[PDB]
Amino acid sequence: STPARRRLMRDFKRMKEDSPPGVSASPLPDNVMIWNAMIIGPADTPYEDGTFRLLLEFDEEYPNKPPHVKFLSEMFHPNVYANGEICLDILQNRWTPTYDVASILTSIQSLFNDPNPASPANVEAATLFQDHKSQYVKRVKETVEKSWEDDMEDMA
Amino acid sequence: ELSDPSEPLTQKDVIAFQKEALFRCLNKWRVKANQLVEENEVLAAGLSKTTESVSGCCSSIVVLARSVVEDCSDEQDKRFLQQLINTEDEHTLTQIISNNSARICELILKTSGSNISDNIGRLQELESLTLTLQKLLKSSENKLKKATEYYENIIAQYD
C-alpha cells in the first residue's frame, strides 16, 4: 500500500492490459519488489527471435529511483556487462519518472536494434562490432540459440 | 496453436515461439547445407571430367616424343624425353608436361625440323592461362545456374 508498491501494481496492470510487442513481465507471486521480465529480439537485428530473460530489482524509492535491472541470459552486447547489468543512459542518469516496466524493457529491446558505442561493457563485443561484424554476429547468434532452452517457467 | 493477441504472452506461447524460431534457424542451415551438397556434386563432376579429358593431350605428346628421341642430339634431352615416355602415370605425366611444356615444344620443333618461334615460352604461358580462365569462368557461370535453379525450386515450394 506504500507509494512504491502501489505504483508498481499499476505497471503490472499496464503489462496485463497492453503489453508492448515482444515483451512480458510480472512480479513474483509473493514479492512485488522483484519482477521476471523477458525481451524477444526484434527483427533484422543479430538478436532476432532471441528469448532473453531479465530480473528487475526495486526499492521503496520507485518511481523516483530507477530499478536495478540486469540480464539472466548469456548476453553478448557492448552495452551489457558480464554480470548482467546494463549500461543504459535511462537507467543510470537519464532517469525520468515517466518510465514504467513497459518502457524500460522496450528501451533495452531497442538496444539490440542500434547499439551505443563508446559505452564498452564487453570490450570484446564493442570492438568486434567495429572490426569483425561477422564474428560479432556469430557470437550473438550463439547467445540467441542458448536463450531458447529456458522453457520460461517464470511466466506462470 | 495458442494466441490471445491482446493478452500478454504465456509460457505456452513462448515455447511455441522458441520451437518455431528453432525451425527458422534450422532451415537456414538446412538450405545453406543442401546447396553446398549441390556444389560438391558440381565440383566432383568437374574434377573427374577434367582429369579424364587430358588423356588425349597427354598420349598425343608421348607420340611426338617417341618419334623424336631417336634423332635427338643432346643426351640430357634424350633422358628427359625417355622420362616422359616411361612415366606410366597420367597424373604424374600431366605435371611433367605442364611444368616443362616450353622445353618439350622446343625439342619437338628442333628435331622434327621446324623453326622454334622466339617468344615461345610466353606464348605457352598465356595460352594455358587463357584456357584456364575460360574453364573457370564457365564453371562459376554453371555454379550460378545450378545455385539459382536450386533456390528457385525452394521458393517454388513456398508458393
Add this chain to the structure above:
Amino acid sequence: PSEPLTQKDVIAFQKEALFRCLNKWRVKANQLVEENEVLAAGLSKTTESVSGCCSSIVVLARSVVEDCSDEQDKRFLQQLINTEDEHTLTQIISNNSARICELILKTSGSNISDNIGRLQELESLTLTLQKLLKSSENKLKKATEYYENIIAQYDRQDSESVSRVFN
C-alpha cells in the same frame, strides 16, 4: 520422422531434438565450406595442369600452320588454334591426335607468325577474363545471400508465432 520437415511439424518435437537437428546441419554446412574450398582449389590446380598439357599442343600447331601444304590442313589447324574452349580442345585433340601428330612432324615450317602481336592479344584477354571471373564470383555471393535472405523472410511470413508476438 527424425527431422521437422515443415514449420507446422515443429510442435511435435521437443527442444532437445530440435537443438540436435540445428547443430547437425550447422556442422554439415560448416564442414562443406571447408570441403568446397579445398575442392575448388583442386579444380583450378587440375585445370592449370590440363591447360598446360593441351596448350603445348596449340603452340606446336601455331608454329607450323603458316607452312602447311593442304588447305584442308590449314583449316583444321586454325580451328584447333582458335577454340577458346578447353573441353572442345580435349575432344579435338583426342579424336584427331593421329592427324595432329602427323601434321606437326611432317609439315615442318618457319617462324613467321606475329610473335609479339598474339602475346599482346593474350595479355588483354587474360586481364579481361580475370575481371570477368571476379565479377561472376561476386554474382554468386550476392545470389547466395539474396536467395537465403528471401527464403528467410518466408519463414517469418508463414510463422504464426511471430505474427502473435509482433502483430
